[PDB]
């Protein structure tokens, strides 16, 4: 198999840069249209991270920052598969995640919300997907939180995530929400996404058969990245 370029990003499946309902995008979006280029080796390559450097608790947000007890909050496992748009598994991709604690408070110098800080919770983790594209991490479910867009804006609970995979063109940062959160229908950041089916692609689903008795609930969330086409005739990449 000789790989060709990644399929073009479908701009209609993502939010636009300029989205006036999310106020800070007004001064942080370009006025010019993006310039599309034909891909080169630069766009189809990406770095490799070795599992050797990762700690044993890097994907366990319940224990990785715990000092003298456990963090307060709802114990949950999140797992799923990362695939490319042609359904192929994405192997050894770097998944980094971050989130607020159970109060909706982020452990960050710029977050001064009154929601209480939890001395035993940090809110960040990472892991590499396996050969089947599978990933799993454990954490405390985050609480929704208020932020200033309109004065009484509130975001539904969410976990932020980032992926660095096989090609630089696949680079993506997004966030997923939890099935049934009533704030999903009100969020201006989620509403920057044009279509209802793509807004639904960010909702993690309750996975009841995988709950662990007297311990933790479980949510299922799959991620899809751009995929490469195979070449059978001229290969102009180089």
């Amino acid at each position: 198999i000789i790989w060709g370029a990644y399929a073009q990003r479908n701009t209609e499946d993502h939010p636009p840069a300029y989205a006036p309902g999310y106020k800070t995008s007004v001064l942080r979006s370009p006025k010019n249209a993006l310039i599309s280029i034909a891909e080169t080796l630069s766009e189809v390559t990406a770095p490799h991270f070795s599992a050797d450097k990762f700690g044993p608790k890097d994907n366990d947000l319940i224990l990785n920052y715990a000092k003298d007890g456990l963090p307060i909050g709802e114990r949950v496992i999140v797992h799923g598969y990362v695939r490319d748009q042609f359904g192929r598994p994405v192997k050894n991709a770097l998944v980094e995640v971050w989130q607020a604690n159970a109060s909706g408070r982020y452990r960050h110098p710029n977050d001064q919300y009154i929601g209480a800080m939890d001395p035993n919770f940090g809110g960040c983790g990472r892991m590499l997907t396996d050969d089947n594209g599978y990933y799993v991490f454990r954490t405390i479910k985050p609480g929704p939180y208020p932020w200033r867009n309109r004065i009484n804006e509130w975001s539904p609970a969410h976990i932020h995530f980032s992926l660095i995979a096989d090609g630089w063109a696949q680079r993506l940062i997004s966030q997923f929400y939890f099935e049934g959160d009533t704030l999903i229908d009100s969020c201006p950041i989620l509403k920057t996404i044009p279509s209802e089916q793509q807004r639904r692609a960010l909702i993690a689903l309750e996975d009841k058969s995988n709950f662990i008795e007297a311990d933790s609930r479980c949510y299922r969330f799959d991620i899809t990245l751009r995929g490469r086409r195979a070449t059978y005739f001229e290969n102009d990449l180089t």
Partner: protein
Amino acid sequence: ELKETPSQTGGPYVHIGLLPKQANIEVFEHNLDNNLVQDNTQGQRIRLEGQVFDGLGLPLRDVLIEIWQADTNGVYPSQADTQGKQVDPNFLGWGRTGADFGTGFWSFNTIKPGAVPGRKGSTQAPHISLIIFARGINIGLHTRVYFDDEAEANAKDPVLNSIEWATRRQTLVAKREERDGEVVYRFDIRIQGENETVFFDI
């Protein structure tokens, strides 16, 4: 077929997950950073620095930047590189940094990349691929950094020549300076307005 998962802004707290040390969280032993130069790394060491400005001309004090580049011989440290050449074994090719919360300055310590093959037998001028994530930015913005001391190579670069508004090509050229022994390339990014930096859909 499946649709790509849609992008969402990294938000103002992106540091927690990607640069925890900047958010004062010590939880990892190995932390990803902005230093791409290892002791045995080959090539000329350079510093890349600048600021990212918004539409009012103010710097973004919460932006996160990553860069991806080839080694000194223009080979990428990725299995997807098909040149059949040996890559520098002491080079990750990637780094990540965050703008300083008070000044908005960002920098990387890296090496100047060698030229990489372009499509259909062409040669690209030396460049570094860069992406920007921040509150207010819904999808990471991709751009490239070229070097002003490679005018000859830049004039023949396929991607720069593919920008039909020629006056905009200069927004992608960083300026070389020499701060007492060290080579520094200053690359300011202007997201909106006059001299707006070219962004690509790659």
